[PDB]
Structures are given as C-alpha cells and as structure tokens.
Amino acid sequence: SNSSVYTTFMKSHRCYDLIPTSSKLVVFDTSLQVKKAFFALVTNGVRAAPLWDSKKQSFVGMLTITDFINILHRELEEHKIETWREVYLQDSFKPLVCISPNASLFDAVSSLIRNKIHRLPVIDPESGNTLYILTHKRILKFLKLFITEFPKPEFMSKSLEELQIGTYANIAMVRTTTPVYVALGIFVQHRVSALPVVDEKGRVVDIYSKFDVINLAAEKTNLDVSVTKALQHRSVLKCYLHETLEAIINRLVEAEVHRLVVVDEHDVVKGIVSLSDILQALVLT
Amino acid sequence: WHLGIRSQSRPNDIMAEVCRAIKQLDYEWKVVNPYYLRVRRKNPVTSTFSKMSLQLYQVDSRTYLLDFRSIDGSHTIEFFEMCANLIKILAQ
Amino acid sequence: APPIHVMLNHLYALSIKDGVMVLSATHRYKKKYVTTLLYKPI
Numbered sequence: 001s002n003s004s005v006y007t008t009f010m011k012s013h014r015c016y017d018l019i020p021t022s023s024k025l026v027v028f029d030t031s032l033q034v035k036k037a038f039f040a041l042v043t044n045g046v047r048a049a050p051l052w053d054s055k056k057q058s059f060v061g062m063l064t065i066t067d068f069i070n071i072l073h074r075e076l077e078e079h080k081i082e083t084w085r086e087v088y089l090q091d092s093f094k095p096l097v098c099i100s101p102n103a104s105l106f107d108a109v110s111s112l113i114r115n116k117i118h119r120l121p122v123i124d125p126e127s128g129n130t131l132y133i134l135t136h137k138r139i140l141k142f143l144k145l146f147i148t149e150f151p152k153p154e155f156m157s158k159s160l161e162e163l164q165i166g167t168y169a170n171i172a173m174v175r176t177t178t179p180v181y182v183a184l185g186i187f188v189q190h191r192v193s194a195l196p197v198v199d200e201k202g203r204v205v206d207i208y209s210k211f212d213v214i215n216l217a218a219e220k221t222n223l224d225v226s227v228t229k230a231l232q233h234r235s236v237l238k239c240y241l242h243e244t245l246e247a248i249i250n251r252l253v254e255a256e257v258h259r260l261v262v263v264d265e266h267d268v269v270k271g272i273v274s275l276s277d278i279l280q281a282l283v284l285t
Numbered sequence: 286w287h288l289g290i291r292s293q294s295r296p297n298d299i300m301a302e303v304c305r306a307i308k309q310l311d312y313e314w315k316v317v318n319p320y321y322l323r324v325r326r327k328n329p330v331t332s333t334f335s336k337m338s339l340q341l342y343q344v345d346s347r348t349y350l351l352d353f354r355s356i357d358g359s360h361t362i363e364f365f366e367m368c369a370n371l372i373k374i375l376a377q
Numbered sequence: 378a379p380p381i382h383v384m385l386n387h388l389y390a391l392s393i394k395d396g397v398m399v400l401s402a403t404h405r406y407k408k409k410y411v412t413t414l415l416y417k418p419i
C-alpha cells in the first residue's frame with residue numbers, strides 16, 4: 001500500500017501518540033468575561049482554549065479567533081463567553097466536537113475536515129478530562145516526520161496542477177484599498193482564515209488574517225482604515241503549480257505557516273493550498 | 286505558583302472551619318486523622334462522585350499549610366470546583 | 378499536632394486578580410502528564 005501508505009500510517013496511530021510527555025492545558029469557565037479570557041489567552045501565549053460550563057458540568061466547545069471575529073462583527077468584552085455563545089446558540093447548533101485518545105489520527109483528520117474546525121479536544125471517556133487540543137498543524141508535523149523518513153509514494157513527486165490539490169475558484173481576496181471592516185465582513189461571509197491582498201493588477205502583495213483584524217481592534221484606535229495601513233501596524237509565501245507536492249509540504253512545515261498562495265509568474269493569484277488541503281490529499285485520500 | 290492555602294490560626298480552629306465550610310457546602314466528609322480528611326462531593330448534574338483529600342501541614346512556628354489532593358463532566362475540573370468553593374468560604 | 382513529581386494531584390494557585398481565580402494541578406494519564414489551568418470567575 002505504497003500509494004495509500006499515509007492513510008495506513010494514520011489509521012495505525014492514536015491521538016494519544018502526539019500528546020507531549022508534559023503539557024499545559026488552559027481552560028476557561030464560560031462565565032468568564034470575554035475581555036479577561038482574551039487577556040488570559042495572550043499571557044499564556046495560546047490562540048484558543050477549551051470551554052467548561054459549570055451549570056452543565058461539561059465541556060461545551062472552543063474559544064477561537066473566529067468567535068471574536070463574529071463578536072466584533074456585532075460591552076463586547078464586558079459580557080460573558082456564555083452570553084455571547086447563547087446569542088448564537090452555539091452549544092446547540094455547533095455542538096462540541098471532541099475525540100478520544102484511543103481514536104486514530106485518521107479519525108482525527110477526518111473529523112477536523114468534515115466538521116470544518118481547526119481544534120479537536122482530546123478527551124478521556126473514562127474521566128471526562130481534556131488531555132490535549134489537536135490541530136491540522138500538529139498532525140501534519142507528525143505525518144511529516146514519517147514522510148521524510150520512509151519511502152515516498154509516486155504521487156508525492158507529482159506537481160500541484162497534476163494532483164489538483166488546493167482551491168482555485170471563488171477565492172476570497174482584498175485590495176490594498178479595501179477598508180478593514182469590509183474585510184471583516186468577508187471573513188464572516190466566506191469562513192476563511194486569511195485573505196490575499198492584491199493590487200490594481202491583481203498581483204498578490206500581502207496576506208490579511210483574522211488575527212490582523214483582532215490586533216487592530218485591540219488597539220482601540222477605527223476599521224475604516226484601508227488594509228495596507230493596518231498592515232503597517234504589524235510586528236509572502238506562495239507556490240507554483242509546477243512544483244512537487246512534496247516540495248509544497250516541506251515549504252509549509254518549514255515556515256510553520258498555514259497556507260500558500262498559488263500564483264502566476266507575474267504573481268497574479270491562481271489558487272490557495274492550505275494544511276487541510278494537504279491532509280485531506282495525503283490522509284483522507 | 287502556590288501549594289494550597291496558608292493560615293496562621295490554631296490548627297484545631299482551622300479544622301473546625303474546614304468542617305463548617307464542608308457542611309455549608311453539603312459535602313460529606315470523614316476523618317482519617319485529626320488534621321487530615323477525605324471529602325466526597327456527589328455530583329448534582331452528572332449524578333457522579335468526585336472525591337478529594339485534605340491534609341493539614343505545619344510550615345513554621347506560626348504558620349500552617351492546607352493541602353488539597355484529588356482522588357483517582359471532568360474530574361480534574363470538578364476537583365478545582367470543589368477546592369474553589371471550600372476556599373471561598375474559608376476566604377470569608 | 379499537625380505534621381510538618383510528589384506534587385502530582387496537588388492543587389496549585391496563582392494569586393487572584395480581577396475577580397478571577399486560577400487553579401492549576403498536574404495529573405497523569407498513562408505515561409503523559411497534563412498540567413491544567415482553570416480560569417474561573419470568583
């Protein structure tokens with residue numbers, strides 16, 4: 001099963017396998033104020049945290065950048081995570097998705113993909129404890145350690161166009177002139193992590209992310225400002241269709257970045273390949 | 286980080302307070318030692334049990350340390366909640 | 378009277394700030410150790 005090797009490898013291992021020997025887990029009570037939770041996230045240096053509801057005596061989901069994006073899109077910080085989740089009836093409509101330590105990595109990848117989420121809490125059925133938080137990135141690194149170290153399938157050599165991996169239609173992008181609030185709206189509208197920034201020609205010049213929006217807002221100074229000006233407040237990776245899938249992967253993992261902009265010789269944007277596109281290609285397929 | 290909570294009251298008084306706090310809590314408790322304990326909180330929502338242990342240590346001539354140890358929803362989190370409630374009452 | 382990886386299972390705490398209490402403890406799952414921090418409103 002050389003051409004299905006990766007699938008086999010992932011079905012062979014458990015989520016328990018990529019949990020660190022010693023790890024730290026930050027947990028919020030849903031009664032926590034969004035502002036304080038936000039600052040708790042920063043001081044700990046994490047982008048998301050599992051949510052524990054005291055009334056329900058249960059983990060009810062995750063607090064992610066997207067949740068902030070939605071919030072900002074509508075006192076935001078005074079109200080409890082509860083109140084905000086209730087406004088969207090989040091517990092009922094997008095209920096917690098969790099996975100067991102003994103479940104396979106393949107199941108984890110599949111779950112992440114089909115549920116369109118990036119965080120997958122590893123919970124022990126026996127104690128109900130959350131042990132770890134799975135992500136595409138962590139799973140990919142694990143797969144990568146295997147990829148580099150054992151004979152590769154022939155398709156790993158195949159180019160991107162050749163393999164048809166990535167998204168090449170309805171790409172969500174922004175122009176340098178585009179106001180930040182406009183970008184805000186399109187984030188919520190397209191459910192996408194980052195937006196390529198393009199000039200009048202359409203060439204890619206920068207990438208704008210949900211975190212940029214949140215950074216700008218935390219600054220409390222107006223959303224009306226364009227995309228490049230906001231980008232000046234800070235502190236691009238692309239690929240070509242002719243490049244090999246293996247080379248694309250290395251690039252992703254090396255720079256610990258989440259996706260590449262696929263572009264023309266002139267840098268006009270053709271497509272986008274993200275970690276999930278990679279995982280589904282290798283593992284789920 | 287801090288291990289448990291500290292107190293400079295007389296050991297017997299400290300233990301008198303804990304039992305009081307536990308009763309206000311409605312948690313059932315038993316006494317292994319004069320200043321050591323096992324606390325069982327049954328769970329209202331999940332109808333399950335969470336058990337922890339309290340041991341009173343001395344630290345210096347004038348100071349004592351109350352130690353919270355869990356016993357093998359979420360059991361870790363419930364342990365935190367049981368401890369939090371106790372400390373809130375003791376905080377008063 | 379009172380008696381004067383050992384920590385495993387022992388409650389730990391950061392001092393309270395902004396009416397939020399942070400409780401932490403390290404528990405073992407198999408060969409893995411998880412240090413959990415609970416941020417709960419006082």
Ligand SMILES: Nc1ncnc2c1ncn2[C@@H]1O[C@H](COP(=O)(O)OP(=O)(O)OP(=O)(O)O)[C@@H](O)[C@H]1O
Nearest residue numbers: 047061062064065066067095096097117118119120
């Ligand atoms: N395991 C999960 N179960 C239920 N809901 C989840 C889970 N993970 C995320 N969500 C919800 O899905 C939405 C999308 O978050 P997701 O983590 O997928 O992307 P994100 O916000 O970009 O986070 P990240 O920074 O990890 O990419 C969020 O509102 C979050 O509350």
Ligand SMILES: Nc1ncnc2c1ncn2[C@@H]1O[C@H](COP(=O)(O)OP(=O)(O)OP(=O)(O)O)[C@@H](O)[C@H]1O
Nearest residue numbers: 136167171172192193194195258272274275276277
């Ligand atoms: N700007 C965009 N416009 C359209 N589609 C996109 C854009 N960015 C990513 N996609 C596609 O959306 C899907 C998920 O995108 P996203 O970048 O949110 O996921 P992901 O990045 O794979 O998750 P992670 O950030 O953990 O990799 C992927 O198929 C990706 O190809």
